[PDB]
Paper text:
LpxB6S was crystallized with one molecule in the asymmetric unit. However, the biological assembly is a highly intertwined, C-terminally swapped homodimer. Each half of the [name] dimer consists of two Rossmann-like domains with a parallel β-sheet core sandwiched between α-helices. The first Rossmann-like domain is composed of the N-terminal half of one subunit (residues 1–166) and the last helix (369–382) from the C-terminus of the other subunit. This domain is connected via short antiparallel helical linkers to the second domain, which is composed of residues 177–295 of the first subunit and 296–345 of the second subunit. [name] forms a two-fold symmetric dimer in which the polypeptide chains crossover at helix 14 around the dyad axis to swap the remainder of the polypeptide chain. The reciprocally swapped C-terminal segments wrap around the opposing subunit in an interlocked arrangement. These extensive interactions bury a total surface area of 12,650 Å2, forming an [name] dimer with an overall ‘bowtie’-shape. [name] in our crystal structure appears to be in an open conformation.
Residue numbers in the entry:
A (entry chain A), B (entry chain A): 5 to 61, 72 to 382
The structure:
Amino acid sequence: RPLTIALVAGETSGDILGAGLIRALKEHVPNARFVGVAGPRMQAEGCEAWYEMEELASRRSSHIRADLTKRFGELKPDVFVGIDAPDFNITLEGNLKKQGIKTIHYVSPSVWAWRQKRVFKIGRATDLVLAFLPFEKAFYDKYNVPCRFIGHTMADAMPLDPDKNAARDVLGIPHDAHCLALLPGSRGAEVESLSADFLKTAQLLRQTYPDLEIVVPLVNAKRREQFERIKAEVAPDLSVHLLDGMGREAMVASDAALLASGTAALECMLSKCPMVVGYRMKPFTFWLAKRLVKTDYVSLPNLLAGRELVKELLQEECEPQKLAAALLPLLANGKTSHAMHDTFRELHQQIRCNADEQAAQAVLELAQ
Amino acid sequence: RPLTIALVAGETSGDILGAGLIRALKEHVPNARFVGVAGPRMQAEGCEAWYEMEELASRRSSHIRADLTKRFGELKPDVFVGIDAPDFNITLEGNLKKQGIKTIHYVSPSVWAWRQKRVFKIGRATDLVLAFLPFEKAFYDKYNVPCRFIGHTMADAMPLDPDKNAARDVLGIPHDAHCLALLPGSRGAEVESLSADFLKTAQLLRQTYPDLEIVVPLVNAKRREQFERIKAEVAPDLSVHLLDGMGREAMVASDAALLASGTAALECMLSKCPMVVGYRMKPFTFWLAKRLVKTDYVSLPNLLAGRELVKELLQEECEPQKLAAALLPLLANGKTSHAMHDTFRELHQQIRCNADEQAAQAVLELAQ
Ligand SMILES: [Li+]
Ligand SMILES: [Li+]
Ligand code: NA
Ligand code: NA
Ligand code: NA
Ligand code: NA
């Protein structure tokens, strides 16, 4: 049997990675066979599409993963490559590993692996992880998880020395003018807050550069409508170039870029465009996340007790079946409930000090 | 001159703390004088209201803080107590400390102090911090910031052994039935996601407890309308008790509570109500926050370089004047811009490896 590779991609970006992998492999093994969940580019390179990538871009997903667990198990491919899409591929990679199939996960699932347990899962599910960036490999090295640093595909696609004048000709920007790119972000929460402040920033810069060109790449129609509506109020008399996409051209053309996304900062770096990164998130949200990172807890009872006195179910674990399972023993109103009751009473006593009087004493001691 | 205490409160909760402090102080110094920014309860206890607390609950706030900086400086009070409201009081406390006035900050500003620099600011601005909880004092101990643990006022207000049957009589809950409290949260992002899953959780629990009473404390009319609209779709045929406020009664009455807020978990603890805490936040948001906590950076260029190669302005620093100030040197398109250009070129080279070929090699090595 010729080399048989199973592939799963769940987004256009995965389809691009998959197509490039298939071509490079065919240079070494022109008789290789490719099958799995393929997008149009992977199919163009010859991947048999048991399912279309669009079908993964919940109940249907579960059924597909079950069917693929069965069929790949029967096929016994030489290698299975999960291309990103970790919510789908990590579990699938684990099911196939259970059957002795060699698995690779392509792209570090940084957002998905939000706690240590998920790092362990990646290690159990894969024989190797492919990471775009060096600090991602260093991360997995600390966990004894085999990881190969392969570089970033966007660095292969973008030249070391891009042509600023060419990008300006495409966008219609004069070569003698200073140019500022505003990238308020791709997500909604980002655009709302940061759009107004980015516009105000440009207004301030116009006082120094009265002929400053301002280019705003907008990723889709909804995001465009959002930015226009914000600009109508904040700065209706500010002239800017609103673009449909074309963020790469805007960055290559500009003399500086104001970015919301620390992720788009990579493409800005490869564009050789100096940048400033401004970002805001809800303080309450950041405080809660930081509390979890620093203590592994989120609720005050557990911080006061120093253990998981109270059951905390977070992120994917905050799910009806698990919540109900955690509440049943407590609704019983039996021994375990009385034990928690007693502990709550001790903690209550520990923080019951007549705070009003304490505060008054502290004032008086500082005053004397 | 009799004891002269300056107070600033910016919310109802601060007004309550202030009133209790004034009364306790008057027990030791009946001739004490109180002045500052007072709510109705502080005024009832005799606080002279230069400004009303409602006036702080941006341009107006700046003017008031300026006026208070002047007048308190002239008054030279024995002590100034900033009651919570850290966005306003920490700066004011610093201005007064500059003039030799002794300052206390009441309530740990946990959300406000989102990074180490702000901890240093609290220390510089205050002679003493008053913390409700022991782990808050331990935190400030690590920074050599004087902090007194005074206990939590809510623990003084709530009895060690509340009357479950009494709270049930208030709410109209039968004494023989099992009762579940659903507290989907006080904020909007919380209610949206967590409301549906909390309702589904209750539906599951009804399969075991067909006569389970379900009480839902809703903090205001908007939040109520939100929950009702979610319930119309998710579970219109589920009978629940929708309450206007009365979260304390609901928790004292219930046999178990399902809580979104790790903060309301304290009041649940003092109610002696066993609880399960379920919470979700946007993974992308948590990933970004965790990245910042772990590395002090948010943008990929700085993670790749290992320093602040690129200027990052986050939270209160993400502000037009500072953003424009950071962009001016780059728009100049001079020496500093060319230096960043050169560094970007070196980093580009470091991640330019022909990733497609690397991935293909890794597949082939694993297949052989
Ligand atoms: Li105490
Ligand atoms: Li390389
Ligand atoms: Na121009
Ligand atoms: Na959890
Ligand atoms: Na009942
Ligand atoms: Na910053």
